[PDB]
Design a protein around this ligand. Structure first.
Ligand code: FDE
Ligand SMILES: O=[N+]([O-])c1ccc(O)cc1
Length: 137
């Protein structure tokens, strides 16, 4: 289930973080707008960019803690509050989270592994909704 999925992603987090984030950028190429230095690079080059590898693991480090503190795929309102505030997110929509979660779900569904894809769908939908209540456009 969802709890074992957090343990699975954490056991190889930098490769899952990178492969899921690349799935996202490849599904939603216009999403590179928010990351201008990622444009004009393949997946093998992005992996070679220090901040790509660092930022994508740190995103995933956070997402996995929020997942871990969730109950029944419902994040802590305190965790949506932290996210909306961030600093980087000054410019960021719930749309961009929904997109990342559509990418994450398809990646899970397409893998040979027993990921609880429906739970991740639920989680993203619920994180979006909590970000929308904590004051994200
Ligand atoms: C679209 C999108 C989505 C997202 C999501 C997310 C989640 C879930 C979580 C997160 C977190 C974060 N962010 Fe985040 N995000 C985004 C975006 C971004 C950007 C653009 C930035 C800046 C950096 C770079 O990469 O360049 C960030 C960013 C970020 C960070 C750090 C890095 C810096 O800036 O310094 C962190 C930790 N973000 N995030
Ligand atoms: O997954 N994410 O939201 C990310 C991943 C990498 C990055 O540089 C910024 C945001």
């Amino acid at each position: 289930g969802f709890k074992q999925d957090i343990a699975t992603l954490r056991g190889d987090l930098r490769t899952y973080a990178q492969d899921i984030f690349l799935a996202f950028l490849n599904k939603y190429p216009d999403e590179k707008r928010n990351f201008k230095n990622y444009v004009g690079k393949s997946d093998q080059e992005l992996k070679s960019m220090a901040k790509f590898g660092d930022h994508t693991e740190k995103v995933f480090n956070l997402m996995m803690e929020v997942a871990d503190r969730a109950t029944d795929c419902v994040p802590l309102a305190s965790d949506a509050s932290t996210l909306v505030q961030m600093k980087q997110h000054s410019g960021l929509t719930t749309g961009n989270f929904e997109k990342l979660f559509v990418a994450l779900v398809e990646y899970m569904r397409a893998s040979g592994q027993s990921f609880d894809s429906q739970s991740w769908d639920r989680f993203g939908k619920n994180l979006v909704s909590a970000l929308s209540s904590a004051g994200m456009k």
